[PDB]
Ligand binder design. Structure first.
Ligand SMILES: O=C1NC[C@H](CO)[C@@H](O)[C@@H]1O
Ligand SMILES: O=C1NC[C@H](CO)[C@@H](O)[C@@H]1O
Ligand SMILES: [Ca+2]
Ligand SMILES: [Ca+2]
Ligand code: NA
Length: 432
């Protein structure tokens, strides 16, 4: 395989998709690339240029400089967060705060930092509304009013990378501290077997379920422990990352039909409490490698490789007891090449490139639409039927992962590269 040629194809396809966004959805949150229309993501009828923001670091890394600058210039002229509407704190941080930060780090443009910080200050109100510092799920961007305290580990614990970078750049430790305090809350309440339930109440500070998970509602909490060690040298986070993964390997790792899975378990007793695994769990194969459990990470990756070989597109959810789909639609999901990149950064094994190339080519074969790339309706029909949405994360995640895996671009210091859970580059840009 000529990896450089494949990288050039990824770049060409990304530029083509960008052109569709400009033509049909300029300044809007998401393109619906089958109909050639747009939709809002955070606040209905008050778009915040989501996909444009998500795309920026990807554009820069690919050397799509005119496109990058057009997006940055749109942000500088147009993007405001003084909006009387409710935004989901978690999504707003990982997509918009993180997307502005990566664009700031690539370009050096102070305005992008000013806007990231303005947004983080609006989100901070959600943390301040809890006596525990656990953020409420929604906040009014203008007024600070909060709603829905019945939250989860991912939505209380996927801030430290973006907030910590804000603290580094601004000099104000308050961001780092607020994010770390929320994670410490649940870690301090681990069971005797070292697990946390995934569901937590922001006001009582108590768990609201008994289910420990590595999967949706928890996932990126575990990443951000490791990532805070990597980015900030935080010794507590290093310890916690390893402890949490050790507990998961002891109590959640189970084999079904010869394949490794991590079903949900009772956080105190370790009894299996669910049989589903989502596609989104594939991130964990990469995290396992990062924390020094690479053999287990490769074993887990292999479970998803099997799903890809069997089903073409990895099912959005599977039953681990049968290895078959629980849902037929998809979200055009990036977690398989996420894992491939993260494991490849350890040893540079070309196997990961081969696996990611399958994934990219399958994306082209299934999700291509008139004006971009779309999520799927039914992976079981041939052809697979399509829905009509390009999720914002596509612009930050899988095209970037493919390009990083194939390009060996001089724009990134691969030894220093750090990616958020939304693939925002938070370290490793090499000035041109
Ligand atoms: O981002 C995704 N959907 C939202 C979940 C948190 O509620 C999160 O865990 C998942 O990765
Ligand atoms: O961590 C998150 N999970 C869900 C999305 C990707 O599927 C994206 O928002 C991010 O990766
Ligand atoms: Ca992620
Ligand atoms: Ca990660
Ligand atoms: Na991005």
């Amino acid at each position: 395989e000529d990896w450089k040629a494949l990288a050039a194809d990824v770049r060409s396809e990304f530029q083509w998709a960008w052109q569709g966004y400009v033509a049909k959805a300029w300044g809007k949150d998401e393109i619906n690339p089958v109909s050639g229309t747009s939709r809002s993501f955070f606040i209905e009828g008050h778009d915040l240029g989501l996909s444009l923001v998500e795309a920026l670091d990807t554009l820069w890394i690919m050397g799509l400089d005119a496109e990058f600058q057009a997006g940055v210039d749109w942000v500088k002229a147009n993007l405001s967060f003084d909006v009387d509407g409710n935004a989901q704190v978690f999504e707003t941080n990982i997509r918009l705060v993180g997307g502005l930060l990566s664009a700031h780090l690539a370009s050096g443009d102070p305005v992008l930092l000013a806007k990231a910080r303005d947004l983080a200050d609006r989100l901070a109100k959600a943390f301040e509304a809890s006596p525990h510092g656990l953020p409420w799920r929604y906040v009014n961007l203008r007024t600070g009013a909060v709603s829905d305290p019945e939250t989860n580990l991912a939505e209380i614990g996927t801030y430290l990378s973006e907030f910590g970078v804000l603290s580094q750049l601004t000099g104000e430790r308050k961001y780092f501290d607020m994010a770390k305090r929320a994670m410490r809350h649940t870690l301090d309440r681990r069971s005797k077997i070292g697990l946390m339930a995934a569901n937590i109440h922001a006001m009582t500070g108590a768990f609201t379920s008994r289910n420990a998970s590595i999967d949706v509602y928890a996932d990126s909490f575990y990443e951000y422990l490791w990532d805070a060690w990597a980015l900030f040298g935080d010794e507590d986070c290093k310890r916690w990352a390893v402890e949490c993964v050790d507990a998961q390997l002891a109590h959640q790792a189970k084999r079904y039909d010869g394949r490794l899975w991590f079903p949900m378990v009772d956080f105190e007793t370790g009894a299996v409490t669910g049989t589903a695994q989502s596609e989104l769990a594939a991130y964990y194969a990469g995290l396992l490698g990062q924390v020094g459990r690479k053999a287990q990470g490769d074993d887990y990756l292999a479970s998803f490789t099997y799903l890809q070989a069997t089903f073409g597109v990895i099912p959005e959810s599977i039953d681990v007891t049968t290895g078959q789909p629980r849902r037929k639609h998809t979200g055009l999901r990036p977690e398989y090449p996420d894992a491939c990149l993260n494991l490849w950064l350890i040893d540079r094994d070309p196997r990961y490139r081969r696996l990611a190339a399958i994934h990219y080519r399958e994306m082209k074969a299934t999700s291509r639409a008139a004006f971009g790339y779309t999520a799927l309706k039914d992976i079981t029909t041939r052809p697979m039927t399509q829905d009509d949405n390009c999720p914002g994360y596509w612009w930050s995640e899988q095209m970037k992962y493919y390009y990083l895996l194939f390009s060996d671009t001089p724009r990134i210091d691969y030894g220093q590269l750090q990616l958020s859970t939304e693939a925002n580059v938070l370290r490793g840009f090499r000035k041109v």
